[PDB]
Amino acid sequence: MRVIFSEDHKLRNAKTELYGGELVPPFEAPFRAEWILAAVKEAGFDDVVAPARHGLETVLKVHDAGYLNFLETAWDRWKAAGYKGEAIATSFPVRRTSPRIPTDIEGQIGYYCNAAETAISPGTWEAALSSMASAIDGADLIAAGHKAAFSLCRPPGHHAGIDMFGGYCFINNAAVAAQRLLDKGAKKIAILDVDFHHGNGTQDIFYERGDVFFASLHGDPAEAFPHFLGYAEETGKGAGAGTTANYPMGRGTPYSVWGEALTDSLKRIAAFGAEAIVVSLGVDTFEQDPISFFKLTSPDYITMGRTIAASGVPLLVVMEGGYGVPEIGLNVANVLKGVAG
Amino acid sequence: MRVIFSEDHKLRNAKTELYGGELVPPFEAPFRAEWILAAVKEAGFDDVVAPARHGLETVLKVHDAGYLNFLETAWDRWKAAGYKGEAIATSFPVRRTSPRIPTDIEGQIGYYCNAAETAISPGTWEAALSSMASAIDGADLIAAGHKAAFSLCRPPGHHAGIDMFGGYCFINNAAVAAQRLLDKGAKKIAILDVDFHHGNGTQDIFYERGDVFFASLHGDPAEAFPHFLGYAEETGKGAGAGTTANYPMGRGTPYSVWGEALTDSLKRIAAFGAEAIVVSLGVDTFEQDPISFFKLTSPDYITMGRTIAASGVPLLVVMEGGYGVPEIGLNVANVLKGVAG
Ligand SMILES: NCCCNCCCCCC(O)(O)C(F)(F)F
Ligand SMILES: NCCCNCCCCCC(O)(O)C(F)(F)F
Ligand SMILES: [K+]
């Protein structure tokens, strides 16, 4: 398959992340892309191509325009306000707040944020657009008839909702890819989110839409980030009724249990009639992952890729999370081996 | 008038505040209380007494029990979870989230928080209870017939809502005082919030209650913290219809304009028939305040106190904000001079 990857991911090189009450170097840092790219090449996936640039036509169909305008100028406005650190939200529109949008940068950064650990830094918008472009070009390969492709997205995307950034995400790459496939002629698309964390952003985008089915396997939100979405009872509303399937799982979950949820999610997707599946691939389900509590082993990733590809419909694999250890590369490459085998 | 003050405020001595993307020493620091106490004594208000301790009977009528239980153990749980900094929320229940309460400390601190600049530190709960006690004893003096009293509360209270902390606030001292006056026999009480910031916490507590009228003068939430409440259109709901009056004002507002809103707020309170007024007094309206944009001068505080006391109804003055310079003490003492003169 083709691997789509932009060196412009490096424009997102934030100095800080709010973690454990401290400002520390971020878990989601450029070395992740370096390690993943090297490992996929080592596994024989060396058809690596930069994405063509894209404008906003596709992304405007999944994200709010005000939100995207906010991301475009957030850094400039923060710096102009005289703040000395990176741009980090403080006040949030929580229970029983006004729905009004503030006008100043501090109010707006909170309005448009779901998670304060994520700082906006110079280059973030440009990096996010390059990552979106990798997802779009991946989608275009699937629309053109390829049965597999890998979009090596960074920054990741699945915590970005209709109008909010957080969890290291700004533009929901998988959502944009799904939209691109619909725009190219698909009538029904699924997104299968196997990252350890719930894709709350993706769920938000498609919750009331019947053209996209969203399935997520993830740490129970009662005790895992993102904390406020991802319960099994959330199945969709309005036109999207019955098109969200959440599989929350608990501490220590191994493949023998996680794979049963995978099987079920694929049954759901097949019954929905997806013409293609966008896989939001995080490898933070790994037993060594520093911020996560599942216990998948490196061989399990091959099984996972094979099982998802046995759906018999085309796959776009879109990179999400997976942290800390160089094995993040091996684990992603193993999913691709399972898909390609 | 009696000044009620607890030395246990010092148990809240947090090391960090998230401001401008940095962790800096908090603005809401123990020295504020020292500066204020010294200035009130200097102005002749030297009848200073410690509050009697109180349990939870009054506060349970204005704050949610789960919220108070959370505050009682938050620090211990944060430390037990292995985090190295103070306890600072990251993920928040913002637009289109599940209403469910997480079980873990990271989920719960976000569930129960409206603003991430405020860290929970060891001693915070104990300090908050002492500050609440000062408000309760102040209220009891008014209930017993005194026409004025000053509760030198620290930490402050007016950003704490039914089930949320933030803005340096944990227990809404003014709300507890109002409830105490109702419990002692009043049928109608007003809270007049003259701190620069909107009392979003106080508004939340009484929004659907007809027994308390809430008026606030504050920086416009379109461009001032707390950003997500405080618009003039918010007038109450259900049983509380017509009992919230917000007076948002803009950059550079001087007393000649601010005092017009004060006059109107007092006219509203009089028409409501308040039997006493709890004044949420912050002096961050001062022209030198480091985080605020109003332009009151020190003499204006005497005018303010005189005008509020000309209501002819008993006042409990409850300390809120005011930062940076020892003149916060002069400014508070000047309000008391206007009340007592
Ligand atoms: N104590 C737990 C702290 C959790 N902090 C935020 C973790 C964000 C994870 C992001 C991701 O892996 O889901 C993505 F795919 F988006 F990259
Ligand atoms: N760039 C603006 C940063 C604002 N940060 C939070 C300010 C909280 C003010 C607290 C207060 O003064 O309203 C209280 F009365 F509660 F103490
Ligand atoms: K997931």
Ligand SMILES: [K+]
């Ligand atoms: K106010």
Ligand code: NA
């Ligand atoms: Na849907």
Ligand code: NA
């Ligand atoms: Na009310």
Ligand SMILES: [Zn+2]
């Ligand atoms: Zn993840």
Ligand SMILES: [Zn+2]
């Ligand atoms: Zn204030």
